[PDB]
């Protein structure tokens, strides 16, 4: 739904009924709303990666009040499967962060990933649905959790050849690849 | 999830459907610089009520302990209770959450590879919990060498296989300044 | 001098002596508890504590009657307990809130005091002499106390005990069968 994403849009990757996809988590103008409504699971998800994101951004930019002030809007696309809905959680933190910062993401970056109030990665599934669905949209960087790895080369060579990808532990380097 | 645990951040130990699982409680600001507590990990009322009465007396506690850190009464602070363990065994959690407070509020880690279990009274008094089978079964998949129990469950930990319970360095309480003693040795005695 | 349902005598430690202290849950104007007769964030808690056992407790034994769950109430707590007795009326608020929910009086005479935890576990308070004191002032010849404190009451000089109905007790189920015969 984008080739360049405006200020608070990250294309995370979700795991489909039918297969991977490509959905962008949207926030837009303290509060978050959140809409494609999903059930309390990826609400407190959500809630989890917005207090994250509040606490990052005293420490990052102590000077910025945007995410402790504002009233936000977010939107999950609906499509994830219920279990897959909190592994767009470094996505949602990545939207607050690019919004609050008025800063819009690194073009051609995706990412999935469980995030935690401290910041802990988790892992997640649909390892080769989401690299696929990367692949067919075109990105060539990819963010994946660090016990996600074996999961990674386990693919396909004609899927994973040619990606450049990180495994993360904490948020904050998936902060820098979309941030530099 | 940690080998070494930040500040607000605990090892607790769960009675699950499944069995036993040693679940991370974390705490951390949400806004900067009276106070207040956001909660997360799904609770129904009394596991929500659970986390008050422990935000409660950490409150309580480090007043006395901490006479000068007003970091509990004045600040914004989440606190995440991660899901996993049975409605009747919610309780439990609290000293677990008691401690995450006051590391959180004292800039101190946890002693590592502790985990604890233990419901905690207004006067921080710790009552007896189950699934203690599962929870040392838990504590010893997760590599965890000190387990800290409540003394009312010494009969629950005694009367298990000794493999089981075997390598674990055990200590049974009675009150939250017992646990707070194991769990930040090098803060102030009393 | 007839209990209504939701009135209930608690027995308090103020920092002079003993008090009897009725507390007194009614409807007033999701339910909501509103609390009076001001004490301490502790005090505030155990409310809260109260309330919330009792609503599920209710649940557990009356599936049917949805009262704790829908009505706005006032509960009133009066004042002079000192700070550190302040989680003793427990279960005084619980048995009050219970009392109006099955809209039936608490027995007569009969005074009660402890801590009562989420899951229901009776917990030990202090100023057991004082209380035992201020019962017997009031005309109480049966009161509900926490089994921990069972050393404390026997520790009293035989004077005081003697002729007291006294009930000990380690799960607030043992205070309903009591209560509520």
Redesign the interface.
């Known amino acids: 739904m984008y080739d360049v994403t405006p200020p608070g849009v990250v294309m995370g990757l979700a795991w489909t009924a039918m297969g991977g996809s490509t959905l962008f988590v949207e926030t837009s103008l303290?509060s978050l709303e959140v809409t494609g409504q999903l059930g309390?699971?990826m609400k407190?998800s959500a809630?989890?990666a917005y207090?994250?994101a509040?606490?990052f951004l005293?420490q990052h930019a102590?000077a910025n009040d945007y995410l402790?002030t504002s009233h936000i809007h977010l939107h999950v696309p609906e499509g994830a499967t219920p279990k897959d809905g909190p592994s767009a959680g470094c996505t949602i933190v990545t939207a607050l962060l690019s919004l609050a910062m008025g800063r819009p993401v690194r073009q051609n970056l995706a990412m999935t990933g469980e995030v935690?109030?401290?910041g802990?990665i988790?892992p997640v599934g649909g390892i080769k649905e989401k690299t696929i669905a990367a692949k067919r949209a075109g990105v060539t960087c990819i963010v994946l959790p660090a016990e996600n790895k074996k999961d990674f080369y386990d693919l396909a060579a004609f899927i994973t050849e040619g990606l450049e990808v990180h495994f993360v532990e904490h948020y904050r380097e998936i902060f820098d690849i979309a941030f530099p």
């Open positions: 303290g309390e699971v407190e809630r989890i207090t994250f509040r606490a005293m102590p402790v935690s109030l401290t802990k988790l």
